[PDB]
């Protein structure tokens, strides 16, 4: 092993992104829940206290005040999972009207149940002015004892949405859903899913999926194309249900990772069949990130050529300004469809660095920042809490971060600082994964300096350096947090499991920039 | 269509019985109930209230009493869940050291759902007498408002059982259970499902179930067996959840249908072994009941050549009198095998009238009898409460009916006055399924008589007859209150769908004798 100014291992370590974004960006970041069941406290009252509080809190004026903000400004998010929003006025209205009630039927409750999913998608996409306007937040402290100097702003509208979504949950417990499938559950779920509960949660989440994809095949309908023999009000349950199905493979595909075992494998409606086939790209291609085959360059070909015909379709879309559905809409195909179009590149970057891909790599991510800064013109900023910019945003700023440490580029360098930029204006309303997102652009910036001001090593055979030990320990470090072994001992019994400066450097930077802060 | 003295119709009349057996007499009478959520009162409390009463009633001399029949009689249906009983000891005596607490732990509340899961199978298995000396049933009238002159053995046993069972759900749900995969959880459901819970609740227990095929998957362990490389504490987990799994997937087949979509697909653990062995040759064997595809000769053949080598396993296990365990676990094995030989020899009577087949059928019938009526020399009596017995007994008594309608046999005439004796003698604990059962017996006589007293027509190319069409009108009616396409369009809105002297035989019969009756 001696000095080396070679290159030939930048190939093996474009490969190694794919993992690592897989582990790190994916799975460490948004889906690994540390959980030590003997300090976690038991739901003795099951939620009763909690959402007795807030069931009261939230009043019929306001309520109604959400629905009309959803009707206004939310149809591209819950069409496909509750279908046209106006039936839905009538459960409210019928929710208030049994409010006082002492005795209640499932049936009742699982509209409730419904509503209140609604209202949680509702708080978390208000603007915060909106949401002044309508609710005082000093109920709030008075009963959860916070800082009464604590505003809306300041990380309490995530809060009222939190416990929102616990209340839909505890209403859909109040229902015995587990004796009682019905498809309340998985509209409800759905509805929940536009919003970053499961992020929050996501073994609750990955449980209720596995309950949704249970409800679902209970029904036994595989096919959802209306028949000549067919009752009309039978033709639209299953149209109804088909968009529900898809809705919720793009909640499966989203979920995925070792904590998700189970899979479940006209017009408006147009686009929902829009929304899916963008879903269903992204992940052929991420498909490739935690394996060790690469995808034939014939099939990144073909991925092209599908994306080139959505990419069609999705700028033919009008969008009527003056329509807040239609603006949203828009927004939410033209992010998707360009995060698509970043994948495709980036994945011809590293494995066959195809001619022209940095530079497609480098003006989709500018595309996805315009279309975020776009935004900032208000009266659309609330577009921007959308989940799918925040899990976008990560794997851009992480790879660009990454790409920055090892190959030189002006461009690249300056979209780079752009990016991070950008990512410090998201919405507060992500909470601690921004600052989590954050910190690990800082900890790959921190980790370019290290690359810098200390040489690489060759044995001849391989190359050494501790930013490659880092990196590489970052991926063990995670896979372990993982690992269900240790719970499945601590479950079982009592048992209990026994079993150079280059050192000096990892075990440094490791201490100062514990990968496990990304974790939850 | 004239008169006819024919029999060519008994060849698909026996291919009939196959669908008939899966949904009258599995389907409909164990996992099909009724669900009208309109009229279905909520839980707001959500058990609180009711597992207030019941925790505060088992007092800790009692529940000690509990492990100790457990402990000496119920190993052979425990072992497989929760391995060795002596730990669970500790489990009980730190459940009391915190009865008291304010605050409980998610860890500790796992413990304490899995020791009351083992408390309800106590409870289930428990003979009456033992069960008088131990508790007053007293506490419960007062608080259940029940008539205070119902005793222990008048179904109020089984009262007692099934809210053991819904405290032992409650304190797992004080666990989140959705928010925390642990092992415990299916190990509690793995000894409620030794009772009759799964035939209660068979939605609820469907659900739980496919909570628990999520949990296993959640380990990732595919494979069992111990590792060189592995810590003994690790090798002692993966052997220990190999049973589960298999114990598992014993449940998984038994609680198979419509409303089941998800499917899981040494010494004492050489038990466990040949347990799940003779299982899976049962579904072998049942897979073709709602199958139209007959099983090849070769196939039988094949299943009976596997059969005899575990009858001899089976013979050579020896099983001490002096303890109960051992005799549990003898009659456990004697009574599937015999199950699995009365089918494979009703499988080749029915599909290819094989020699000696009815002979077989006759034997397999009384050796099954033989077994349960064995056990009425009491201390031995509370075995016939295993579901098994019922299960066998119901298909059983069900075909010799059925065989008994439309072929002449003194032999099996007289073993079916023998098996309608048998089923009035089966443990009470069994509930209102024994009634459906007797019911659906009756009610195939009846269908003899009315076979005798008419005629069987002939068009030429079919044959035609009352009884015929009741029999295919009693899968007709099972098959559609299985079907979920309604309770799937009353959870999406408001919408409501619209769409001879042999005529009035069939209607009179079926307002006499209403197949809907043996449902729940
Ligand atoms: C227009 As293209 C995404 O095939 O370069
Ligand atoms: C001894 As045999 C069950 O093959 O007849």
Redesign the interface.
Same mark, same amino acid.
């Given at each position: 092993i001696t000095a080396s100014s070679s290159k030939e291992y930048l190939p093996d370590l474009l490969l190694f992104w794919q993992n690592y974004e897989y582990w790190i960006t994916n799975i460490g970041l948004y889906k690994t829940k540390q959980?030590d069941? &003997? #300090?976690? /406290?038991?739901?003795?009252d &099951?939620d009763?206290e909690e959402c007795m509080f807030w069931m009261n809190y939230l009043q019929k004026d306001q309520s109604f005040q959400l629905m009309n903000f959803a009707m206004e400004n939310l149809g591209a998010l819950y069409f496909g999972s509750i279908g046209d929003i106006s039936?839905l006025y009538l459960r409210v209205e019928q929710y208030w009207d049994r409010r006082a009630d002492k005795? !209640? =039927? $499932?049936?009742?409750?699982?509209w409730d149940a419904l509503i209140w999913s609604v209202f949680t998608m509702c708080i978390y996409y208000m603007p915060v002015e909106k949401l002044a306007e309508i609710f005082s937040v000093y109920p709030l402290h008075e009963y959860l004892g916070s800082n009464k100097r604590l505003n809306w702003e300041d990380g309490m509208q995530l809060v009222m949405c939190q416990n929102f979504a616990r209340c839909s949950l505890f209403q859909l417990?109040?229902?015995?859903?587990?004796?009682?499938?019905? *498809? #309340?559950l998985v509209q409800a779920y759905l509805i929940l899913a536009t919003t970053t509960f499961p992020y929050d949660?996501p073994?609750?989440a990955? =449980?209720?999926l &596995?309950?949704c994809? !249970?409800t679902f095949?209970?029904?036994? %309908?595989d096919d959802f194309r209306p028949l000549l023999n067919d009752?009309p $009000?039978?033709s *639209?349950?299953k149209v &109804?249900?088909g968009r529900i199905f898809y809705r919720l493979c793009g909640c499966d595909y989203l979920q995925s990772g070792? #904590?998700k /075992? *189970?899979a479940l494998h006209r017009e408006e409606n147009s686009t929902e069949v829009l929304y899916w086939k963008i879903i269903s790209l992204d992940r052929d291609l991420d498909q490739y990130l935690n394996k060790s085959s690469k995808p034939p360059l014939k099939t990144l070909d073909a991925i092209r050529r599908e994306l080139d015909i959505f990419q069609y379709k999705v700028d033919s879309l009008e969008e009527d300004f003056r329509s807040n559905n239609s603006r949203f809409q828009k927004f939410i195909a033209l992010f998707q469809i360009s995060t698509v179009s970043w994948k495709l590149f980036k994945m011809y970057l590293i494995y066959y660095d195809t001619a022209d891909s940095l530079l497609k790599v480098i003006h989709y991510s500018k595309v996805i920042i315009s279309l975020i800064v776009n935004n900032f013109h208000a009266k659309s900023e609330f577009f921007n809490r959308h989940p799918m910019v925040m899990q976008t945003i990560t794997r851009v700023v992480s790879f660009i971060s990454f790409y920055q440490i090892f190959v030189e580029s002006a461009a690249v360098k300056q979209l780079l600082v752009d990016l991070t930029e950008l990512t410090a204006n998201l919405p507060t309303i992500f909470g601690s994964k921004l600052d989590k997102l954050v910190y690990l652009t800082e900890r790959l910036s921190k980790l370019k300096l290290l690359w810098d001001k200390v040489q690489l090593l060759d044995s001849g055979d391989s190359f050494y350096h501790p930013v490659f030990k880092i990196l590489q320990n970052d991926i063990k470090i995670i896979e372990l947090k993982n690992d269900?072994?240790f =719970?499945?001992?601590?479950?079982?019994?009592?048992? %209990?499991?026994?079993?150079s400066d280059f050192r000096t450097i990892v075990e440094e930077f490791q201490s100062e920039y514990n990968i496990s802060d990304i974790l939850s």
């Open positions: 959980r069941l &003997t #300090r976690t /406290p038991a739901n003795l &099951t009763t039936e005795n !209640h =039927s $499932v049936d009742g409750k699982y417990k109040q229902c015995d859903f587990m004796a009682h499938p019905d *498809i #309340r949660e073994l609750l990955n =449980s209720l &596995t309950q994809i !249970h095949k209970n029904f036994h %309908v009752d $009000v039978e *639209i349950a &109804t249900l070792p #904590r /075992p *189970i269900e072994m =719970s499945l001992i601590k479950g079982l019994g009592s048992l %209990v499991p026994l079993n």
